[PDB]
Design a protein around this ligand. Structure first.
Ligand SMILES: CC(C)(C)n1nc(Cc2cccc(Cl)c2)c2c(N)ncnc21
Ligand SMILES: [Ca+2]
Length: 456
């Protein structure tokens, strides 16, 4: 009965999350800011019935913990679900860790005590995460004392995971083996935290591989080691906690509660022995984060380019039919009607919450441009891809940490492995872009490879 757009207005896009886009919204009466996840019913399948989802939402709204995201409201219309909750502005935990100069076991213990405190609380209330990963650890604010907030607790129980690689980047590292075969319980969150902790103290995933399926093979076997030089400077109690958290049989695996009482958490979170900086771990987390973000940006660039081609042609045909005399020009109200018609057929955009948002977007394009609708189409569609094109170059620049301007063949293999692009498929594309290749590409050659890898 209650309508989302009657209460909230979209201010700006915050980013892509599991199951949908996240928009910064504001209450039209009280002025309260909130983060809203818009889940498209067409793109996301429900695992449970409507009554099971409503009962979990009602429970989730009443729960409260300092390391769990607060949910405020829930709305549903014919095509979408709107999960309304608190905004966090500190960004992802790993993007903050790589910005600092020193990082020790004391810092890793403070991080993992918070995550475990949050998990322990949600497990007492019979809610499992299942998809716990570093990307779901947000920092409350930009300050250095910011608490960690776990996002998306309980959503995997009600919404089916996407099968598209652009949505699955980095999920294989943290997923518990029992989730892969179907019988799982809340212990799968201890395993995921165990993996996160292993990466905090070494900067390398315990179960790794050249592609998604090779990682899942390592996870399913469950075998890993502490045989990297960097593990020599780490305490034995940290290694003990990891062994208990990455125990294969879930009934033998330590609980979230007992992980808090472990010697490592008790010792390294108290204010009262020597603790050095894990320099090799920071460098490995910075290289790991750069790689994951470039693979993700490459996949989102290709996805936006295909979506842009579909919408450019659809919008061009809508305006062509609306052109009565055939002079190639239309009025403002016509362009609004046609642009609204694009969202009616292709589905409402997360940034275009209602007619007023569409009218403002049309006005923003008309400020750049009886008007030539082909010029309106070009500008409107280039504005939709702007964020994905700029995010690609920024991620290439961040990955190119030595500012050489190029990435090597070994780095391309790693990037395309995380992106799940077949080895022979990208090597074939490189040869068509630059026939006299020397085992390295610059940004334009890399973007040219991606354009070819999505039919251009
Ligand atoms: C993916 C990004 C990082 C953009 N994101 N995701 C979230 C989590 C979220 C946001 C709204 C609803 C739900 Cl169910 C989950 C969120 C939040 N709270 N505050 C700021 N940004 C957020
Ligand atoms: Ca370089």
């Amino acid at each position: 009965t209650a309508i989302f757009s009657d209460r909230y207005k979209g201010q700006r896009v915050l980013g892509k999350g599991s199951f949908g886009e996240v928009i910064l919204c504001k209450d039209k009466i009280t002025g309260q800011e909130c983060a809203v996840k818009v889940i498209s019913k067409r793109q996301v399948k429900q695992k449970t019935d409507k009554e099971s989802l409503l009962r979990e939402v009602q429970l989730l709204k009443q729960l409260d913990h300092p390391n769990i995201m607060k949910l405020y409201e829930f709305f549903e219309d014919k095509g979408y679900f709107y999960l309304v909750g608190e905004v966090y502005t500190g960004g992802e935990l790993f993007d903050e860790i790589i910005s600092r100069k020193r990082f020790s076991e004391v810092d890793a213990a403070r991080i993992i005590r918070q995550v475990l405190s949050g998990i322990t609380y949600m497990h007492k209330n019979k809610i499992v995460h299942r998809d716990l990963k570093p990307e779901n650890l947000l920092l409350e604010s930009k300050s250095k004392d910011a608490n960690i907030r776990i996002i998306d607790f309980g959503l995997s129980t009600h919404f089916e995971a996407s099968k598209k690689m652009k949505d699955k980047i980095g999920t294989a590292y943290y997923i518990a083996p029992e989730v892969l075969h179907g019988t799982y319980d809340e212990k799968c969150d201890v395993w995921s935290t165990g993996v996160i902790l292993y990466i905090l103290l070494s900067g390398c995933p315990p179960f790794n591989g050249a592609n998604e399926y090779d990682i899942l093979k390592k996870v399913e076997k469950g075998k890993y080691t502490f045989e990297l030089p960097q593990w020599k400077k780490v305490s034995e109690s940290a290694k003990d906690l990891i062994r208990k958290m990455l125990t294969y049989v879930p009934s033998m695996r330590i609980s979230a509660r007992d992980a808090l009482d472990h010697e490592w958490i008790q010792t390294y979170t108290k204010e009262q022995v020597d603790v050095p900086s894990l320099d090799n771990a920071i460098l490995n987390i910075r290289q790991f984060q750069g790689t994951q973000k470039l693979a993700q940006a490459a996949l989102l660039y290709m996805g936006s380019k295909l979506t842009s081609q579909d919408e450019t042609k659809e919008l061009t045909a809508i305006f062509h039919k609306m052109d009565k005399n055939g002079d190639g020009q239309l009025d403002r109200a016509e362009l609004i009607e046609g642009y609204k018609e694009l969202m009616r057929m292709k589905g409402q955009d997360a940034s275009m919450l209602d007619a007023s948002a569409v009218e403002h977007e049309v006005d923003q394009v008309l400020d750049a441009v009886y008007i030539e609708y082909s010029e309106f189409v070009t500008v409107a569609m280039d504005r939709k891809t702007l964020l994905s094109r700029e995010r690609l170059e920024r991620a290439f620049r961040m990955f190119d940490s030595d500012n050489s301007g190029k990435i090597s063949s070994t780095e391309l293999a790693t990037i395309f492995g995380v992106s799940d692009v077949d080895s022979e498929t990208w090597k074939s594309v490189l040869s068509e872009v630059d026939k006299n290749n020397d085992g390295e590409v610059d940004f334009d050659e890399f973007q040219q490879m991606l354009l070819k890898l999505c039919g251009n």
